[PDB]
Symmetry: D3
Subunit: 233 residues, 6 copies
C-alpha cells in the first residue's frame, strides 16, 4: 500500500506518536498501551495501534534524519489519514537555558538542509508546529507539573557536525538543542495541511559535555512519554 | 541618542507596541493611552509613552521593510532597554478564505530576504515569536471573543511581488498573509534575546484586489489595538 | 490612488528629487523652491511639487532600506509617471579615497540584499544608474566647482552590520561608501525603464571614525541640494 | 560504544557491505555467509560478520537518506576501522539505458542535498567512488557474466519528489536512476580517506512504471549480492 | 615572466586594447598601427606594441570567457603595469531595438558566473567600468559621428545559453547584449585599482536571428576599432 | 560552419584529442599525427586531422577555463559529430599523494563554477568521465609502465585563486590537483551523450611550490601524449 508501511487503511488512529527508534516505539506499546498490536514492520520500522486511558492512539517509527522522517510522515498523512503527529525524542542541548532531563517544545525548526528551499521557492520557509497542538502541550505540561522549555531547535543533516564553532551563535538565536528531524516533520505537516509537534528530551548537553546515565535516560524518557500520551487522550 | 530615536533613556516602558506607520502610532496614542507623551520624532517617526489601565506602555513607529524595521527594534532593545515588542501592522491576504480586516497572529515568518542567511550561517533560520507572548495573545483574544487566525506569514522585500504565481504554494504551506517586517522583528529579537510577536490585520487582498485606504489603515483596526493593549496589561 | 501616496494624478513633475528623511524633503521645499506645494503625506512620508529657476521639480521622501525605497519609486513611476529620479542622502564612507563633505556619484550599487536575484534569474544583476543622468551630474558638478567622487556604493540591508570586517574588502573593489537604498532605486528604475542616479554626501567616515558636526551637516547637505537642483534645472 | 552501533572492537571486518534495509542484511547473513554472527542491533539496525569462501566479510544496515547513511559510514570508518564499503541497494530507474534486474555502478552521485556544499566550501563537490573498487566491480561482473550498467545516480533528499518534471533532464545527463544515499556515502568515504562504491539494483523504473515480480526481485538482487561478495573476496 | 605572457617588463604601454580573438588583435596591428612589434605569443595569444598616428598603445588577446579574460587582465595589471584596459569585442543582441553592427558601451556587466560571489563576500558585486573612460568613449563617439548605444551587458558563462526564455527579462532590465568576458574584466579591474571599459559590436541577434562569419571581423567592424584608438589618445 | 570553428563537417574524426594550448596541439600534429592536415584556425585555435597507427584521429585546442572549453566541445559534438573527447593538459598539485611528472586521471571534477548549477536544477551535478574511456586509460597506462594516479580534480574559474587557504580541505576530499576545464568538458559531454576523459600532468606543486623547468614540462607532457594516443588507436 506504500513502499515503507505495510499496514492496511484504517489501522492508524488519526493521532500518531512518532519516534526515530523502532525499539522505543515497541517499548511504548507493551508498557503504556492496552490492546496494542503491531500494524506495520517494513524494514523493521515498527508501528502500532492501541489504547491509552480508553482512547485510540497509533505509534510509528521513522528512522533518523529529515529524509527518513519525511518519507513516513508523508505516507501517514496522504495514505493513512493521520491528522495529528507528535514526535518525541532526544537531542543535544546547546543553550545554557536548558540542562539535563529538561523537555523542549520546538516552536521553530531551523535547519542546514536544502529540503525546505527545494519545497518553497528557494526562500526561507519558517518551519513551525501547529499552534493549537503546542497549546495542548503547554497546558498538559502544566497539569502534569512539567516546566516546558520553549524555543527553537536546529534540525541538522549532520550528527557529527562540521560547525561546532557555530553552536554559541545558534544558542544566541534561541536554539535550545540540536536534533535531526523537526524541520522535515514541520515542513511535511505544513505541505499536507496536517498538525505536527516535536518534543525534545535533553539526554545530552553538548556545551557542558555532560550526559545522562542509561538509567536516568529511561526515567527521563518515561516522563516525556506520559506527556505525549496525556495530550492525545 | 541613536541616529534614529530622539528619546532620553528611560522614556520607553519595557513593553512597546510597534507600527510601521507613524500616524497609526499617533492615533493609538490619542485614542487609547492616558498621559501620552511624545518621546521621539526623528524622520517624523514618532514614539510615545503613556498608560493603559494603569500600566506603562510605549509605542514606536518602525517604517516599511525588514531593513527599516531592524533599525528601530535593534535600537529599542540595545539602547532603550525595551524587553517585549508587539508589532500590530497590515498585511495582504493570499487565500480567498482569509477575509479582509481579519487579525492574524504570526507563529512564524518566512521570508525572501537574505538577512537571516547573512545573520545565521547561510542556513535556514526559522523566524518565530516568543511563545509566552503568543500564548498571551491567543488567551486574550479568546477572553475578548475577537477570533484570531494563527499561522505563518511571508515577509517580503517586495510590496509589488514578482512572484504572484507562487501565492498558492505559500497558502498551501500555511502562510496566511504577506507583510514586510515580521522576519526582521523576529530575527532581531532572537539575536538580542528579547520577546517579540507580530499581529497584523488584513488590509489588502492580493487575489481579489480589494483595498483599503491610506486613512482607513490608520483607523479601522481598533480590535487589533485593544487586543494588543489588553495583552500588555 | 496607490496605498502609500495620496497625491492626485499629475501632481508630480516628471523629474523628482528623493531623500530617505521626509524632514529634509520638507526642508528642501521650504528653503529652495518656488510655489512649493505639499502633494502627499501618507505615513508622514512627505512629498512636494514646486519650481526651481522657472522649472518644475518634485520632491519625495522614501524612508530607509531597499524595500521601502522600492515601494515609493515603483509607485512614483508606474502611477504618477515620474521619469527621472535623483536621490540624495548621507552615507558612511568606507574608502581612503573619500573624506568628509565629499559628494559621491554612485555608478554602481552592490548589495547584500536578495532582491535583485529575486528580480533577475538568481544571477548577479549589476545595478547601475542612467548614463545620461550621471553625465549631467558630472558636468554640473564640474561647472559648480564641486570635486565629484565617482565609484560604487554598497547598498546594505543592515545599518548595524554583522560584517564590519569586510569593509576593507569592499573599498578594495571600489566601494566608496555604504548606504541602504541605491541598489533598489537602480534596480527599480531598470525594471521600469526610468532614469535614476544616486548622490551621497560623506557625513561620517566609518574607518577613520571622523565625522561632521550638525552645522557642517546642514551645509554640506545644502551643497548637494544645489547640485541636484542645478542638474534638474 | 557509539550512539548507533553496539558491536565490540574488532567485530567488523575491514570489508563491509551496506544496505538501507536491516531485513536484507539479515537475509544476506543467512543465505550467503558461513557462521555469520549478529554483532550490532541498536535501533533494530542490524550488522553481522561472517565468511564467504573462507574470507571475512561484515554487513551493516544504514537506514534511509544521506543523513542516516553518513552516521553509519562515519562510525564504521572512524570507530570500527572499516576500509572498504560496498553499498548494495535498490533505486528508481529513470534512463532507457537500464531495464529492471539491471545492476548499476554509480560512478558519480549528484544530489539536491546541501550536505556537500556544507562540507566543501559551498562549491560543487563531485562525489565519486574509489576507482579501484569500481574496477574490481567491473572485472568481477565480467567473470560472473553480469552486464554492469555504469553511470551517475541522483541521490535525493526526497522519495516523493517535488521535481518529477526534471527526470528527463536528469537522465539526459547520464543519471541512470534515483536513490537516497550514494552522495552521502561517497562524500564520507572521501572525507575520511576510505574506499567506497555503490551498486544499485533496478527495482522500479519511474519512466516505464514497470515494476517486476517480488520473486524476480530476490533472484536479481541475489546477483548483486553475489557480485558484491565475489569482489570482497 | 608570467605563465601566459611572453613579454619583457616595459614592453606594454600603460594603455591597452583587448580582444578575445588574437587574430583581430593582429588585424588591428597591421591595419591601424605603425612600428608595430609583436611582444607576446604564448598559446598563440598575440599581443602587440605600436603607434596609432604617432601615439603609443598596446593590444592584447584575452581568449573567451570570464576565467580566460581574468588571467590575462590580472597579469597585465600586476606584472606589466597596464593602467587603462579598453576591451573591444563582439556580442549577441537580445532585442529588436539593437542592430547587428551597433556599438554598445557596457556601463554594467551582470553575469551568471559565480566568480564575483567568490570574490565578493557571496554578495552582489555590481561590476562597472571606470567612469572617466566611459565619458571619453561617450565624447569620442559624439565627436566622430559614431552612435553609441549605452546600457548593461550580460556576461555569460554560456555561448549556447540554457535560458533563452529569459532574454526578454534581460532586455527589460536594460541589458542590450550578451557577451562572455566583461564582468571578469570589470571585477578584475576593480580588484586591482585599474581603469577598464568594455565596448561591444553586435555580430549576432539572438532573438531576431542573423549570424556573422568568422571571417567578417573587418570594416565590419573597424568603426569600433577607430573609436577605441581615438579615445585612447 | 560555426562561429569558432571553420572546418568542414567531416573534417573531424569521431575521436578527438584536446588541449588548452593550440601550440601544444600543433606540436602533437607534427610529431605524432600521420598525414596531419590543419582543419581549422578561427581565433588561432588550431585543430588537425590525421592518422595514428592507422586510426583516424583529430586534435583540437579549446583554450582556458570552463566557458572556453564548453564552447568548443559543444561545437565538436553537435556540428562535427565527435563522440569521444580525451583531454590532456597540466595541473597544479594540491595533494601529498602526487608529485611532479605524475599523470592524474580525473574520475570527478568538482568546481567553483556556477555553470553546472545553471545547467542542472541548481543542484549538485557530479561531473564524471565516461567509465569505459577511463578503463582504457587505466589499462593503457599499465601497458606503458605509467603509474596512473586517479582521483578528483578541482576545476576553478580562477588561475589566481582567492581561496588558497582551502587547498588542504580539497586534498582531504581526494582532489589531487587544480586545473580549469575538466568540469566543463565532463558536463558538456554528459549533456550531449558523448564520452569524455581528462588527464593532467603535474607541472607545479601548489603546496610545496616545486615546479618543472620548461625542458621537464615538455618531456613530461610527451609521456601523457603517448598515453593519450595509445588509448585512442
Amino acid at each position: 500500500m506504500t513502499p515503507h508501511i505495510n499496514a492496511k487503511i484504517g489501522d492508524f488512529y488519526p493521532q500518531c506518536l512518532l519516534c526515530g527508534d523502532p525499539l522505543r516505539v515497541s517499548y511504548i506499546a507493551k508498557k503504556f498501551l492496552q490492546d496494542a498490536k503491531e500494524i506495520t514492520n517494513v524494514r523493521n520500522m515498527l508501528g502500532f495501534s492501541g489504547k491509552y486511558k480508553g482512547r485510540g492512539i497509533s505509534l510509528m517509527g521513522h528512522g533518523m534524519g529529515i529524509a527518513s522522517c519525511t518519507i513516513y510522515v508523508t505516507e501517514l498523512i496522504k495514505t493513512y489519514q493521520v491528522k495529528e503527529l507528535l514526535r518525541i525524542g532526544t537531542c543535544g542541548a546547546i543553550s545554557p537555558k536548558v540542562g539535563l532531563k529538561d523537555i523542549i517544545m520546538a516552536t521553530g525548526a531551523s535547519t542546514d538542509s536544502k529540503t525546505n528551499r527545494v519545497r518553497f521557492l528557494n526562500h526561507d520557509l519558517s518551519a513551525t508546529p501547529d499552534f493549537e497542538l503546542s497549546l495542548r502541550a503547554y497546558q498538559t505540561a502544566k497539569r502534569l507539573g512539567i516546566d516546558l522549555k520553549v524555543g527553537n531547535v536546529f534540525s541538522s543533516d549532520f550528527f557529527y557536525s562540521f560547525e561546532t564553532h557555530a553552536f554559541d551563535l545558534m544558542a544566541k538565536y534561541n536554539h535550545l538543542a540540536i536534533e535531526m528531524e523537526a524541520a522535515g516533520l514541520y515542513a511535511t505537516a505544513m505541505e499536507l495541511n496536517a498538525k505536527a509537534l516535536c518534543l525534545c528530551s535533553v539526554s545530552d548537553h553538548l556545551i557542558t559535555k555532560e550526559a545522562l546515565s542509561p538509567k536516568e535516560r529511561v526515567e527521563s524518557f518515561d516522563n516525556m512519554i506520559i506527556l505525549a500520551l496525556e495530550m492525545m487522550s
